[PDB]
């Protein structure tokens, strides 16, 4: 039983680390929002060019 409780604590640690990775993907500067803005602005400039 104590081994299974330690296993559940391991799974909670895995959930917290996956949340930390998701927060890093949100909070990085080179996220999807920067690339979305880049492709929209560059599509406009590309068409006028």
């Amino acid at each position: 039983r104590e081994a299974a409780v330690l296993q559940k604590n391991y799974l909670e640690t895995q959930q917290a680390q996956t949340q930390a990775q998701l927060a890093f993907l949100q909070s990085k500067f080179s996220n999807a929002a920067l690339y979305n803005w880049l492709r929209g602005r560059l599509s406009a400039i590309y068409y006028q060019f």
């Binding site: 909670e12 959930q15 949340q19 927060a23 996220n31 929002a33």
Partner: protein, 48 residues
């Protein structure tokens, strides 16, 4: 009972569910680049 063990069984309270962790990406908004003062050079248009 005769031995002191209870007839009626105990209540089993429900444990709390594991919550779902939330994150967010707050964003900033700095000003744009403003145009400096223009100086006239000495060369013609294709050179400049």
């Amino acid at each position: 009972t005769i031995d002191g063990q209870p007839l009626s069984l105990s209540l089993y309270a429900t444990p709390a569910d594991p919550s779902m962790l939330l994150s967010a990406a707050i964003t900033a908004s700095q000003g744009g680049g403003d145009l400096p003062h223009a100086v006239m050079p000495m060369y013609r248009f294709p050179v400049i």
